[PDB]
Design a binder for this molecule. Structure first.
Ligand SMILES: Nc1ncnc2c1ncn2[C@@H]1O[C@H](CO)[C@@H](O)[C@H]1O
Length: 296
């Protein structure tokens, strides 16, 4: 099948620019389990010319992986070789032979954006008094917008943009991650999937949910939901609404209401990302500019 060809090709290939000796990698605690597999903290000796040990993260298959999970791992590997941007998680290498496949990536010290925002709720007296300033939250959104503009410029649809898939690294810098589901879109400008997708329902654009069409403009939809997560410090979208109810809810034009601690200007941006007609939504270059207007 397609996967056996991919596995067979990937094994035959050498790729010295990315192979890393397994003996030079030491794995540590688990940082979390996502889709495709788990992530652990690790340290790497003599990595990409860096003398001594470097702290890294390691993406590997989970126990009892399926073909779909193995395909996502290889698909994330292949995508990460092609991208290089300050707000996109960085690949350092991989371990293929004499053991299970490991992807070595930049370590993000603060973890996922969602967890970082939820943890910030515990700082201070209570919900009516936050520890992150609105200006800090806008900066995060802007940083992510810049990374998406870059990914769109090279014809990649991320498909899975959400706070759980954004990493916060040294200096509170945003790093887009979780590229297992992203798809190259150079030829046609869209990606279509016949099967039911594995993106959470509550982040999917209405044309991806009904018609299975993914484009840069459905990425903008998800970015609109991401803005909602950020502004709510990691809230859960469409609270109390079962995912199965979203089909009818979105079809009839309903959208999430303006949340607490959200300016009217920021809400106008959210709603524009959720327009039913994809071409009526802004492009990421315009989202960046609109976020800049909110900066002081
Ligand atoms: N480079 C990384 N650095 C730190 N934590 C990560 C990294 N990649 C994934 N994770 C963690 O694993 C999960 C995403 O796979 C999240 O819980 C996140 O905290």
């Amino acid at each position: 099948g397609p996967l056996s060809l991919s596995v067979d090709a990937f094994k035959i290939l050498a790729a010295p620019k990315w192979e890393f000796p397994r003996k030079n990698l030491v794995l540590g605690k688990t940082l979390g389990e996502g889709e495709f597999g788990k992530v652990v903290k690790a340290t790497a000796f003599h990595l990409k010319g860096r003398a001594g040990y470097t702290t890294v993260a390691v993406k590997m298959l989970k126990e009892n992986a399926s073909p779909s999970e193995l395909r996502d791992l290889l698909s994330e590997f292949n995508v990460l070789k092609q991208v290089n941007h300050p707000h996109v998680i960085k690949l350092y290498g991989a371990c293929s032979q004499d053991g299970p496949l490991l992807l070595i990536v930049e370590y993000a010290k603060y973890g996922s954006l969602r967890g970082f925002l939820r943890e910030s709720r515990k700082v201070g007296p209570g919900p009516d008094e936050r520890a992150l300033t609105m200006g800090d939250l806008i900066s995060f959104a802007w940083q992510i917008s810049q990374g998406m503009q870059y990914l769109a410029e090279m014809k990649l649809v991320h498909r899975d943009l959400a706070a759980r898939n954004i990493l916060v690294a040294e200096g509170r810098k945003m790093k887009i991650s979780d590229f297992g589901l992203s798809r190259d879109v150079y030829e046609e400008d869209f990606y279509v999937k016949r099967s039911q997708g594995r993106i959470p329902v509550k982040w999917m654009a209405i044309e991806s949910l009904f018609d299975h069409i993914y484009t840069t403009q459905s990425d903008v939809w998800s970015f609109g939901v991401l803005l909602w997560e950020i502004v709510t410090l990691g809230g859960n979208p469409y609270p109390g609404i079962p995912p199965e109810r979203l089909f009818n809810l979105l079809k009839t034009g309903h959208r999430m209401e303006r949340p607490d601690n959200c300016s009217e200007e920021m809400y106008r941006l959210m709603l524009q990302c959720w327009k039913q007609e994809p071409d009526k939504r802004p492009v990421f270059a315009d989202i960046s500019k609109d976020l800049e207007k909110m900066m002081v």
